Design an enzyme around this catalytic site. Structure first.
Site, mmCIF file in Angstrom:
data_model
loop_
_atom_site.group_PDB
_atom_site.id
_atom_site.type_symbol
_atom_site.label_atom_id
_atom_site.label_comp_id
_atom_site.label_asym_id
_atom_site.label_seq_id
_atom_site.Cartn_x
_atom_site.Cartn_y
_atom_site.Cartn_z
ATOM 1 N N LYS C 33 0.709 -1.517 -0.048
ATOM 2 C CA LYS C 33 0.073 -0.150 -0.562
ATOM 3 C C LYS C 33 0.994 0.911 0.365
ATOM 4 C CE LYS C 33 -3.649 -2.287 2.985
ATOM 5 N NZ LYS C 33 -4.481 -2.637 4.007
ATOM 6 N N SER C 124 -9.632 3.352 8.053
ATOM 7 C CA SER C 124 -9.939 3.054 9.566
ATOM 8 C C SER C 124 -9.044 2.294 10.577
ATOM 9 C CB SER C 124 -10.558 0.923 9.340
ATOM 10 O OG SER C 124 -9.582 0.093 9.215
#
EC number: 3.4.25.2
Lengths: 174, 174, 174, 174, 174, 174
Positions: C33, C124
């Site tokens: 990521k 999140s």
């Protein structure tokens, strides 16, 4: 909001309150909801955007210019584009419009409605106004203006979304 | 977020807080919610997405040179494009804009409101700011800026979505 | 997912975990990521499609080519199309991008956000990372890399959608 | 439906079940959810509408001759058109595709995932297949096909939406 | 609203009520829900928005000169444009149309139904009208108009959204 | 509605009931849901608009003209446009189609499905028909027509949306 229109003895009017609401609070208390059109021959009131108005009324004026003062026609021609023109289609509102000829309601749906006795009562307070107007009109000699006024107060008194600021627009003809 | 605008004696302001909320957490605390436009002759605050506000303010400027800086007229056109146009139509934002002629709200619903005394209070904390601003403006000789600031802080105390970071652009026309 | 970026002592980083989730189960546990861009000058991390990335990062690179390494500008120019171009409009994601100049977040909304201290915590698990990063950064002499790392672990420990696979990308300048 | 793909020693497979469910009833029991593409050099399974899969696979082939059969690169382009394009954007399907270089998922969210060991398990019964496939692949010398089949059956036992009809395309590259 | 159509001995009718309901209040009581089209050779009633009906009826006429007044064939084309076309597709209305060859329903779902005995009953009160119309038509020598009217009134007694204002266009072909 | 198709001993059929429902009441009880196509060579049944049919069947006929009686192909070519053509995309329905060659279902999704034994049972009563048809077909020497018929009755007996009006269309070939 509450828009009330009444016609009695060569006198037609349109009256409205001035409350704009956002959620559970008042944004503004003096919104002008009743104007004048077609070289101060055609009166009108409304419920909606201050711009939607200034767009729907300007156009309406032209439809009148394209149909020699004939209220109804321009009106019919208005609700026409208003339900067709890609852009125009987004403006939401309820125009109350009346001239010496007659009075009626136009809706985004393209409808042109002539109420039982040129009696119009649109908006969240509409029915309370109608009820009070109908009462007065059937049991008293009061005037078209006195009616709408009193009817409007009754409304703003019942309707949590209607206040007591008024904007009346008459029209005499006989 | 709370955007407040008070206007006293040739002095008009616009104060905003700086909280950005995501769900139940604070994402940013120093968001600049107020800024100048049109060669500093115009001040504005906004509720919502920064980039959207940037988009909308840019166009506003554009409309201003278009109508020789006439706030309202140039502002109403913006009320147009906003609801009519495809892209803009998507933008989620509330505009507060003022110059020396008047203060007013601008929403994507073709609505251009100008509260009772040029007193503007928008955003989740808007009412609380309005409440305090009203009180101050009617029981004290305090100034626009003094009121706006004090009002904004009251808002920040009540409103869970408004913090105490401020950005105040002022305009002196006296 | 959790993307953490930190900047201390001429050292900037972006770290992320590698969990992709579908419902209540883990689809993959080693998703990269955090990449590198503009001839390994500009680092970046992200939360979203593996393609949205490979489309949003490629473009970002070009905006940098169209704005001489000036991070911010390309960034501003990026979030621009990303909220305009019919097609581009559908890609959803949260780019974290940082160079020796500065670091920031871009969102489909077209926003360009520079967090309080070049501290970024998106995803999140974002806030848990932020909380741990903020703590460390204010009470210890640890390094930008040591921070993001430790912050990331704390996150993956709290966040049911974040794991312990890391992909760190540093950058020294002084 | 469950699509499973295991890969051991120059042997890579893709096994699917054949149930199509409508509400709470079985509409078809022998749905062919796996097939060959690109002169049999490529195998694929799919969760969802057959016709949509046909549409998507066709284009995939197209993208393959476009990038000299480079699976990923040609696969990523597909991840593009899928979310960007109007028609395709409508398609509801999950793709599982493999050749001798790698196995991977393809979803309409511009996502191109390649699980830990080329171990793919998608569809409502996907996890259960993954669970069994994992166990087998780490405690037995069984083959790709042996695992995929056995895993698929376990899935069919657990998953109310997966049956025991199988279609297995294999690929030997050893 | 209830639109009823009965057909006995060279006599076919269409009767509607005249209530327009908004929420739980009656907006208008004398809505004309029935009218003539195609040089009075065709009669029609409609459930829904007047303006929409006007739009749809106009086109119907158009389709009639197109297919030498062949009701059905010209009617089926309308069933086309209605669901296919963008603007029309938006229209919310139910059509009841009859001539000397047959009676039939027309809905925006490309459906053109012709009930058991040319007995049509649409609108919220439709069934109740159907029920009474059926009974009358099978236990009395009453006429189309007599049945339609009596049936409509029964409907108005049962249906909270149907009143007792009627508009009946008849067609004598005997 | 319930459409049942069966094939046994050089005999293929398609049978359907005639109930159209609106809410909790029957609109019509004799809807023809099984027709004939391609110069009475190809039989078919369906669930949907009476027009969608008269549009989807007409086209299907042409696809047959563009593919020399080859059922399947035209069928494949049909479901093709039906999921592509902007307009065609809106028609909703479930075509059951069968010729001496084979029988199958087409759905707005563009799918072409050949059920286990040329046994088709679509519609809300589909499964009850399937259950009764399957039973008969496996435990008795009855004929394709006798099956569909009896199966259909069983259905209309269980299904609140299916009645006992039938429209059977056979086809002998051997």
């Amino acid at each position: 909001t509450t828009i009330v229109s009444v016609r009695r003895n060569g006198h037609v009017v349109i009256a409205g309150d001035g409350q704009a609401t956002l959620g559970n609070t008042v944004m503004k208390g003096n919104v002008k909801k009743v104007r004048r059109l077609y070289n101060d021959k055609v009166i009108a009131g409304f419920a909606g955007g201050t711009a939607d108005a200034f767009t729907l009324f300007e156009l309406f004026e032209r439809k009148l210019e394209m149909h020699q003062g004939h209220l109804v026609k321009a009106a019919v021609e208005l609700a026409k584009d208003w339900r067709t023109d890609r852009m125009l289609r987004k403006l939401e509102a309820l125009l109350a419009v009346a001239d010496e000829t007659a009075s009626l309601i136009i809706t985004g749906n393209g409808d042109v409605v002539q109420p039982e006795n040129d009696l119009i009562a649109i908006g969240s307070g509409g029915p309370y106004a109608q009820a009070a107007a109908r009462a007065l009109l059937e049991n008293t000699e009061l005037s078209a203006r006195e009616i709408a006024e009193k009817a409007l107060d009754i409304a703003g008194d019942i309707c949590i979304y209607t206040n007591h600021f008024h904007t009346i627009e008459e029209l005499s003809y006989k």
